[PDB]
Enzyme design. Structure first.
Site, short mmCIF file in Angstrom:
data_model
loop_
_atom_site.label_atom_id
_atom_site.label_comp_id
_atom_site.label_asym_id
_atom_site.label_seq_id
_atom_site.Cartn_x
_atom_site.Cartn_y
_atom_site.Cartn_z
N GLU A 1 -20.66 12.19 24.33
CA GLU A 1 -19.90 11.95 23.11
C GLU A 1 -20.23 12.98 22.04
OE1 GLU A 1 -17.61 9.95 24.78
OE2 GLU A 1 -17.28 9.50 22.66
N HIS B 1 -4.92 2.49 32.22
CA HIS B 1 -4.15 3.66 31.84
C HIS B 1 -2.68 3.56 32.22
CE1 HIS B 1 -8.38 4.63 32.47
NE2 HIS B 1 -8.26 5.58 31.56
ZN LIG Z 1 -15.98 11.33 26.28
#
Ligand SMILES: [Zn+2]
Ligand SMILES: *[C@@H]1O[C@H](CO)[C@@H](O[C@@H]2O[C@H](CO)[C@@H](O)[C@H](O)[C@H]2NC(C)=O)[C@H](O)[C@H]1NC(C)=O
Ligand SMILES: *[C@@H]1O[C@H](CO)[C@@H](O[C@@H]2O[C@H](CO)[C@@H](O)[C@H](O)[C@H]2NC(C)=O)[C@H](O)[C@H]1NC(C)=O
Ligand SMILES: *[C@@H]1O[C@H](CO)[C@@H](O)[C@H](O)[C@H]1NC(C)=O
Ligand SMILES: *[C@@H]1O[C@H](CO)[C@@H](O)[C@H](O)[C@H]1NC(C)=O
Ligand SMILES: *[C@@H]1O[C@H](CO)[C@@H](O)[C@H](O)[C@H]1NC(C)=O
Ligand SMILES: *[C@@H]1O[C@H](CO)[C@@H](O)[C@H](O)[C@H]1NC(C)=O
Lengths: 195, 596
Positions: free
Chosen positions: B357, B487
């Site tokens: 991240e 998704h």
């Molecule tokens: Zn990511």
């Protein structure tokens, strides 16, 4: 025995926006310039014709104190030979500038939650600014070729746009209070010296 | 007084008016995802609606700047992304029903609950109820129940909504000068006007199928290896020549074979790494996990995180004062603001995703100088690719012993390397046939090569052939199994996870190449090599300004997606799988079924 009122410039209550930058000339006084550099509280203290090396031992005829508020990455434009929205359209320094550029972060006063929009700047202009020129016009900027007739619209934009000063803004977008000291020398009585 | 100079001034007003409106959009969206409240929900909706209404305002005005007379490419790109009509060329009534479908399809997915007929008192949702059964239980019928009952009770609800979702998305797509809604998604890779780096939408499908053909030898030996391993755990159900049943793959859909490691570990009597416990003994916390991640990036010449990052980002669970969306996210709010929302615990999985991240923020902070409409990755697969390479370099024992988390006297030999690469192949290689087959199904459904009355037949025809996975229960057209995935039912492209996989190993090979790395590629750790971080920074600062074909060559040296770096990462396992399958059957027959 009159000290130059630098507290009225630096410690002023409210500051002007850079498009309408406020100039205050200082004359017939005594200036302890080293007090400003012996503070360690300024984010930017860069001199270009004078030296902050305790050279209050010299005289000048008149010194001007221009002050305004801009972003963090925009104080870079407050320097000789710079370009950009601030340097071209708001405040311009000469290529042979003789003085000092002082700035410091002011997010603790000029930023509030929800956004502080009191300060604004000029985004568009038909020509660049000559050194030390100020423009406080509100005429609509004609980007196209049709007459705007004083109205905003297609290729006709209002020249002045607001700054958004949030407390969570990055350092590059945080409000910085700038004070420019421009020392001027003529064949004149050399008012301000300062021991 | 050109159309180009009039657009430069138009883009100047846009970049300055959008900065504050987009800041108010996410700054209000942050206070919801951390302080969830219906009051903060409407504050997130009001600020998000005015921002999206502003994007519609400027787009119709941007339409009056025809790109036919413009020749500057960066001015072309900002206008293209702005001139995008999107959901607005539709009517004003079927645009509401299209969104009503998208909101309802997402609601049925996130609220779907099923219960067992043996004790209906407790009822399980997908997370964390059914996902734990599909990832921990070795009972054939318990996995069969959770697998079937999910698609049989929530998937059947999505079949009529998805059938109406395909036509409305296709009407919007062709009204925007596209062939189908699949061709609308493939436009993320399209590049026009740059001779020597041009890349059209149809070229993606040819390249996806081309590189996938060179993975099948590795996937087949991985498929046949776990098939023999699964035969030991499910003797009366698996057949050594048929496809793998779908409910025995690690999760509900088999997107990743990661949880099959305990069943398929090559040397299970060799020590695992799992630095998790070592972090609990050393009194680690959320801040030290991210503070150690910051030192990884400053070692390769990247700047340190902004002071507002540590002040504003939420790094652990609120602590019973608020409730948040603990799904790890990386925030680029504009105005130089960068945050990370992730409720971290002391876990090796969270220690690696922290590097993943934070790798997004380093990408986000790099293209901050770029204009607003160019502040994004080169394509959809770039942002997630640069995140994986940060966890790759951080997970190797070359880096774990460096930060003093692994005991230096670790028996690092050729058997532990096979265990690590087998764990990597179950997650990385195992998702490629699942990703390509799933997206191509939607690709052919959007074009029309799959009729409505044969959606589920051709869905499992490609599952048996391309993926090598057979359903345990025969499903008629009342089922909608693809929509049982997030998704698919939440309107998200999925081919991005395929190109992300191949991009991350072209990046890692090129970075370690300039990082003075000796030995196998899988043992690399790019930290302390500022020469590698600089070659990566030269692409991150570009963002969307230059085409991804050129931006890819700025690091790797090739103008197109390449599969060779991926295969060499797993070749020590590839040859090991070849000998471990000498008396096994690699491949699969499509006619076999566990229901016969
Ligand atoms: Zn990511
Ligand atoms: C497209 O337009 C941009 C914007 O003017 C051109 O780039 C700039 O170059 C000037 C110097 O001439 C710099 O002062 C600007 O800071 C640059 N801006 C950006 C965004 O790069 C660019 O050269 C033009 N492209 C072509 C091919 O002419
Ligand atoms: C976006 O949509 C608009 C329509 O909503 C498209 O524009 C039309 O443009 C043609 C000229 O080429 C006019 O004759 C029509 O009258 C316009 N329609 C409307 C409703 O005004 C526009 O071309 C689209 N742009 C893109 C990039 O898809
Ligand atoms: C401004 O006020 C501070 C104290 O509030 C003082 O230390 C400083 O010297 C003042 N600056 C000037 C230029 O007088
Ligand atoms: C959450 O938001 C409410 C108002 O929406 C506010 O009163 C409360 O203080 C917030 N909680 C925290 C921890 O900031
Ligand atoms: C952050 O980077 C600056 C670079 O000027 C450096 O001086 C400082 O020590 C760094 N701090 C940390 C915590 O990395
Ligand atoms: C990087 O170098 C520092 C000292 O220069 C050392 O403490 C650290 O362990 C090194 N890390 C790696 C991964 O080589």
């Amino acid at each position: 025995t009159n000290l130059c009122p630098f507290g009225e410039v630096f410690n002023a209550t409210t500051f002007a926006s850079v498009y309408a930058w406020n100039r205050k000339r200082i004359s017939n006084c005594v200036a302890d310039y080293s007090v400003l550099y012996n503070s360690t509280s300024f984010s930017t203290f860069k001199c270009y014709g004078v030296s902050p090396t305790k050279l209050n031992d010299l005289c000048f005829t008149n010194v001007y104190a221009d002050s305004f508020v801009i972003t963090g990455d925009e104080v870079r434009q407050i320097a000789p030979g710079q370009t950009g929205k601030i340097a071209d359209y708001n405040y311009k320094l000469p290529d042979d500038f003789t003085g000092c550029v002082i700035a410091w972060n002011s997010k603790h006063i000029d930023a509030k939650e929800g956004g502080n929009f009191n300060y604004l700047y000029r985004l568009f202009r038909k020509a660049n600014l000559k050194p030390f020129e100020r423009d406080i016009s509100t005429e609509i900027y004609q980007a196209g070729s049709k007459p705007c007739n004083g109205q905003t619209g297609l290729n006709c934009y209002y020249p002045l746009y607001r700054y958004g000063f949030y407390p969570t803004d990055g350092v590059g977008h945080q409000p910085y209070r700038v004070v420019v000291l421009s020392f001027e020398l003529l064949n004149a009585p050399a008012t301000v010296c300062g021991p | 007084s050109t159309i180009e100079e009039q657009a430069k001034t138009f883009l100047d007003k846009f970049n300055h008016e959008a900065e504050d409106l987009f800041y108010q959009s996410s700054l209000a969206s942050w206070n919801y995802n951390t302080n969830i409240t219906e009051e903060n929900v409407q504050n997130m909706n009001n600020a998000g609606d005015k921002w999206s209404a502003f994007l519609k305002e400027q787009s119709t005005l941007a339409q009056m700047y025809p790109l036919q007379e413009i020749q500057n490419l960066t001015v072309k790109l900002q206008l293209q992304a702005l001139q995008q009509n999107g959901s607005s060329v539709l009517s004003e009534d079927k645009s509401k029903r299209l969104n009503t479908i998208l909101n309802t399809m997402s609601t049925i997915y996130s609220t779907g609950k099923v219960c067992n007929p043996d004790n209906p008192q407790e009822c399980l949702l997908l997370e964390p109820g059914l996902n734990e059964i599909m990832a921990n239980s070795l009972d054939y019928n318990e996995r069969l129940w959770a697998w079937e009952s999910w698609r049989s009770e929530v998937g059947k609800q999505l079949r009529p909504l998805y059938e109406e979702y395909v036509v409305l998305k296709n009407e919007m797509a062709r009204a925007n000068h596209y062939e189908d809604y699949g061709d609308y998604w493939r436009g993320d890779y399209e590049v026009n006007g740059v001779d020597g780096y041009d890349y059209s939408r149809g070229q993606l499908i040819e390249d996806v199928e081309h590189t996938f053909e060179e993975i099948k030898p590795l996937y087949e030996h991985l498929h046949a290896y776990v098939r023999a391993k699964l035969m030991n755990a499910y003797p009366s159900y698996i057949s050594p020549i048929g496809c793998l049943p779908a409910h025995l793959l690690g999760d509900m859909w088999g997107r990743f074979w990661t949880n099959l490691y305990s069943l398929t570990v090559p040397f299970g009597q060799k020590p695992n790494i799992d630095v998790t416990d070592a972090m609990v003994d050393q009194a680690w916390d959320a801040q030290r996990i991210f503070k150690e991640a910051e030192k990884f990036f400053v070692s390769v010449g990247l700047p340190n995180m902004t002071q507002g990052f540590w002040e504003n980002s939420m790094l652990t669970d609120p602590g019973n004062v608020q409730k948040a969306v603990c799904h790890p996210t990386a925030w680029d709010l504009g105005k130089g603001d960068f945050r990370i929302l992730m409720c971290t615990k002391v876990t090796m999985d969270d220690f690696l995703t922290a590097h993943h991240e934070m790798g997004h923020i380093q990408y986000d902070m790099a293209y901050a100088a770029q204009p607003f409409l160019l502040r994004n990755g080169a394509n959809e697969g770039f942002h997630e690719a640069v995140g994986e390479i940060m966890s790759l370099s951080a997970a190797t024992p070359k880096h774990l012993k460096s930060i003093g988390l692994l005991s230096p006297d670790f028996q690092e030999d050729n058997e532990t390397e096979i265990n690590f690469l087998l764990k990597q192949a179950l997650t990385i290689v195992g998702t490629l046939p699942f990703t390509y087959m799933l997206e191509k199904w939607r690709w052919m459904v959007f074009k029309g090569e799959i009729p409505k009355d044969q959606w589920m037949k051709k869905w499992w025809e490609m599952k048996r052939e391309i993926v090598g996975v057979v359903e345990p229960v025969p499903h008629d057209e009342t089922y909608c199994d693809p929509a049982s995935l997030f998704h698919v039912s939440n309107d998200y492209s999925f081919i991005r996870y395929y190109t992300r996989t191949l991009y991350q190993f072209q990046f890692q090979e090129a970075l370690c190449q300039a990082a003075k790395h000796e030995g196998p590629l899988h043992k690399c750790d790019i930290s302390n090599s500022t020469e590698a971080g600089q070659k990566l920074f030269n692409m991150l600062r570009l963002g969307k300004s230059e085409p991804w074909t050129l931006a890819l060559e700025n690091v790797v040296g090739a103008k197109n997606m390449n599969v060779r770096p991926l295969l060499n990462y797993f070749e020590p396992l590839f040859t090991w799988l070849k000998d471990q399958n000498k008396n096994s059957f690699v491949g699969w027959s499509t006619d076999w079924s566990p229901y016969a």
